[PDB]
Design a binder for these strands. Structure first.
Ligand SMILES: [Mg+2]
Length: 904
RNA sequence: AACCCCUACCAACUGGUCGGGGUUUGAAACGCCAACGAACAUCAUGACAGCGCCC
RNA sequence: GGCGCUGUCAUGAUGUUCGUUGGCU
């Protein structure tokens, strides 16, 4: 919107006043407006924007801002006091969440608390995707008999001394006989699993660095890490781990688990410092021997500038200055000589970047001091600002280089000696105990994930905490003095956690598999590419593994895209998901056509493999390239190993894994959204119970998870005991509403008389639905149309199907059983279709008794036309009916995906 | 685009024309130039081990 | 010592998606 970027950020309500906010430094906020009655009382000296009363006091005609409307129309901001008192949450749960989170402090006559609470609510839902992926990764690697790190596996409240030997530590168990034997079985399983060579795929969590080769830690650390991951799983989905576990960590966990988290944080931070101080000892030795300056301060800027982010808004590429600087004849041996400079390329480039940055900073500081001494009107812009202005004025690529060459030349004229010397040849991180356990556990969670997921998670968490801290800073100035209850007391120091997460981002990267677990990785690699050898002979080839063998080792074990799918390891399966030549077209077609749509200017992704597989010639068309590589993705059997034609299968390994990676990640992301939906329905059921409504929470599993939708839909019509009374009440209320219509809205009553006699019959039929809508409990299910749709849906639900849907969504069965039913789909046009076809097939496998009628017809449809049925999905999203946006986004193809909106 | 709110005329009001607002809706609060950090793939570059061919 | 390609890493160059800073109307 134009008003938001125009200079207006938020419009808050406290008491009878209105508190606008214009932007401030970073994500913070500054108060600029005070609206009361019909008055204008802008506070700041410099008016960021001007607003005045609009017509009928229904808004503010914002104007005289930085930039105006492109087509010349008034921009009006809604008055929050127009309707009446403070607007309510669409779910109608403002008071209960305010009381739960802020206790009795929150008065309730404000509009800032429930904006802070929703950020915590989004923190609760973001971690679902990443814990789902992390738990699936460990689940796949061993412990596949029944489950590992599940809802009943590990408790992180049992000390390892009390876990290994329950007999000697029976004091805390109150002398129980079943639990001790169950935990003995669990300890047997853990001891068997800890020695598994398959455990090497994960990095610093389990196999730690000692010297040239990784060494497994003691069982204490691994047991603690598994227990903590199981504790995260327990906290998210609900026992000593309630809904407030991660928020209260130090006082809840035993000293041993906190010791393990401190050990991991110390490991990573100390590794960074020791590396960049004495293991990259050449860099520090150059840092000390650079100029006549204090070594400690120089190192303090060097480390803070290199690894962290401080380049900020200086406005130009330093690296291209250094490129022009290297282009000269004096330092040509940097490129000409490859014997010695190759191992110090990064050091040299970083040092040149640092010295340029430091020169610019020092000049800026000196010029700023001079200008502060001088009058403000006459300002010396200095060289960095004149350079920025020159770059801004230019509008040609080559002309930019014409402007840009001179700066490098003159700085070389100034920086001769240090560059000649380079060419010729105070701990900062926050301890290991001051950091909260939340940050360490987030790091441990990221340590199981992929490169992109880490960045997404930490970026979103940082943004949410910045929002929280800015709102907390705004709270006192607007007259709200609500405080934090002891249970939810973690959110007071949101800024500190934000800083810790920023540092984690500065060192949160992938761990990468070990080099000691190669023996099992050969087995999994040969399994993925269609092996068919007998398992006795296959284990024989495994033990003898360490002809085409050498190819497997050298060109397979270390494949970059191999470490992206093995983390989702399904050895026995996963070769039948890219086996039918009707789903490879879709993923390749989509990526090549849309994602790499700018391959017209060079070698694309599919273009490279097409060129190397067709015979290094031919340029027919994109579609012919999509339908030619699929026949090479399909039938990637190991059993074959005219030889040149067979070599294509070796030639196209790196795309196979990419296809499987896309498919699996899309499936798990969709499943994670469905898990988010069910977590939301559970928490909303609990909240509606706490508010004081009529609900049965114990029998929520038995009923088809439709308790919340049934309650929020309004009056009850499923019970056949008093249908006559309900019908009579609705009829009399509709009749009363129709009779007293002129006083309600005279304009409609004026036209009502001219209607025909039968149109009155339709009007009464619709007024019955109108009254049933009036008898509801929610804002979403208050308009008649969605209420009648949901009411029609509710009458046709089968509870066992819903229960199976929920159980298989939570248990992640689809990502573990996809191989069974994927070859019986004729056409695929969206990931939605594939996921849901798998869903109805898994529901197929069980429900074959006592389902005569609608569900029977729908499953008949899946078996025959081999395409997922939209109506079955619409009946299976009934548990999601109290939030209409979510109900649509999880049942309509067009509205599911934000990226996919152009075609629909 | 979905979903809720708002001015002006129409309008069963379960619907529309010129438009605005929404961190308190769903994974979801901001017109260009000029830069920063993460991941994706291609060209060129020296070094590594290898799948096969010639002297 | 060469012909064809694949796979790791470090330097460099170009295009896409998310999120950040300063300037312009
Ligand atoms: Mg929100």
């Amino acid at each position: 919107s134009f008003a938001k970027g125009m200079g207006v950020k938020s419009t808050l309500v406290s008491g009878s006043k209105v508190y606008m906010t214009t932007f401030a430094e970073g994500s913070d906020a500054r108060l600029e407006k005070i609206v009361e009655g019909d008055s204008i009382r802008s506070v700041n000296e410099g008016e960021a924007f001007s607003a005045e009363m609009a017509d009928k006091n229904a808004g503010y005609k914002i104007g005289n801002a930085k930039f105006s409307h492109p087509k010349g129309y008034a921009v009006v901001a809604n008055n929050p006091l127009y309707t009446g008192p403070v607007q309510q949450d669409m779910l109608g749960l403002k008071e209960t969440l305010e009381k739960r989170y802020f206790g009795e402090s929150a008065d309730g006559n404000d509009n800032i608390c429930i904006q802070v609470i929703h950020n915590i609510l989004d923190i609760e839902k973001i971690l679902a995707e990443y814990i789902t992926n992390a738990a699936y990764a460990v689940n796949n690697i061993s412990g596949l008999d029944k489950d590992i790190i599940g809802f009943g596996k590990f408790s992180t409240v049992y000390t390892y001394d009390e876990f290994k030997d329950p007999e000697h530590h029976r004091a805390a168990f109150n002398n129980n006989d079943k639990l001790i034997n169950a935990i003995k079985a669990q300890y047997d399983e853990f001891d068997n699993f800890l020695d598994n060579p398959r455990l090497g795929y994960f990095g610093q969590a389990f196999f730690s660095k000692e010297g040239r080769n990784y060494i497994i830690n003691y069982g204490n650390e691994c047991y603690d890490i598994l227990a903590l991951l199981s504790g995260l799983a327990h906290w998210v989905v609900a026992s000593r781990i309630s809904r407030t576990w991660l928020y209260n960590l130090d006082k809840n966990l035993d000293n041993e688990y906190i010791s393990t988290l401190n050990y991991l944080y110390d490991r990573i931070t100390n590794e960074l410092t020791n590396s960049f101080s004495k293991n990259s000892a050449a860099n520090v030795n150059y840092i000390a021997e650079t100029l006549g300056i204090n070594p400690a301060e120089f190192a303090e800027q060097y480390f803070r500038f290199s690894i962290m982010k401080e380049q900020k808004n200086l406005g130009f590429n330093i690296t291209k200055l250094r490129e022009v600087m290297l282009d000269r004849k004096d330092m040509s041996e940097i490129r000409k000589n490859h014997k010695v400079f190759d191992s110090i390329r990064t050091k040299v480039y970083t040092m040149m970047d640092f010295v340029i940055y430091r020169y610019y900073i020092e000049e800026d500081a000196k010029v700023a001091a001079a200008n502060k001494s001088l009058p403000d009107n006459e300002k010396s812009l200095s060289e960095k600002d004149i350079f920025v202005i020159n770059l801004r004025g230019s509008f040609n690529d080559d002309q930019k280089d014409a402007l840009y060459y001179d700066e490098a030349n003159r700085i070389w004229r100034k920086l001769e000696n240090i560059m000649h010397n380079i060419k010729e040849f105070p701990r900062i991180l926050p301890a290991g105990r001051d950091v909260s356990a939340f940050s360490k556990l987030m790091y441990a969670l990221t340590m199981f994930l992929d490169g992109k997921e880490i960045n997404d998670l930490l970026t979103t968490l940082i943004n949410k905490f910045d929002n929280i801290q800015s709102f907390l800073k705004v709270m006192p100035l607007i007259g709200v003095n609500a405080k934090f209850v002891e249970e939810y007391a973690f959110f007071k120091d949101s800024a500190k956690i934000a800083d810790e997460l920023r540092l984690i981002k500065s060192f949160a990267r992938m761990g990468e598999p070990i080099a000691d677990a190669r023996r099992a990785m050969y087995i999994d690699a040969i399994r993925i590419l269609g092996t068919n050898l007998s398992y006795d002979e296959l284990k024989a080839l495994a033990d003898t593994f360490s002809g085409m063998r050498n190819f497997i080792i050298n060109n397979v074990i270390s494949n970059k895209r191999f470490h992206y799918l093995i983390r989702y390891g399904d050895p026995a399966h996963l070769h039948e998901i890219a086996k039918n030549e009707a789903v490879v077209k879709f993923v390749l077609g989509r990526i090549a056509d849309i994602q790499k749509k700018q391959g017209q200017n060079g070698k694309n992704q599919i273009d490279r493999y097409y060129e190397t597989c067709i015979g290094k010639d031919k340029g027919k068309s994109v579609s012919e390239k999509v339908d030619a590589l699929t026949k090479i993705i399909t039938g990637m059997n190991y059993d074959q190993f005219e030889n040149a034609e067979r070599e294509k299968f070796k030639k196209i390994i790196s795309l196979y894994l990419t296809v499987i990676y896309h498919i699996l990640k899309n499936i798990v992301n969709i499943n994670a959204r469905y898990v988010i939906g069910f977590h939301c329905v559970e928490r909303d059921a609990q909240l509606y119970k706490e508010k004081g409504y009529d609900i049965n929470l114990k029998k929520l599993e038995e009923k088809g998870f439709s308790s919340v939708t049934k309650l929020c839909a309004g009056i009850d019509e499923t019970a056949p005991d008093k249908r006559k009374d309900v019908e009579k009440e609705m009829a009399e209320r509709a009749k009363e509403s129709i009779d007293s219509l002129e006083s309600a809205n005279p304009k409609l009553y004026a036209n009502y008389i001219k209607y025909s006699d039968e149109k009155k019959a339709e009007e009464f039929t619709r007024q019955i639905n109108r009254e049933k809508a009036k008898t509801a409990l929610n804002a979403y299910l208050r308009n008649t149309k969605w209420n009648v749709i949901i009411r029609e849906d509710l009458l046709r639900i089968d509870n066992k199907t819903c229960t199976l849907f929920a159980n298989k969504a939570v248990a992640l069965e689809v990502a573990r059983y996809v191989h069974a039913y994927i070859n019986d789909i004729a056409e695929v046009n969206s990931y939605f279709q594939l996921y849901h076809y798998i869903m109805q097939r898994i529901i197929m496998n069980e429900r074959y008794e006592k389902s005569s009628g609608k569900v029977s017809e729908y499953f008949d449809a899946v078996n025959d036309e081999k395409k997922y049925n939209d109506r079955l999905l619409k009946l299976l999203c009934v548990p999601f009916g109290y939030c209409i946006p979510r109900f649509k986004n999880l049942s309509i193809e067009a509205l599911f995906d934000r990226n996919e909106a152009a075609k629909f």
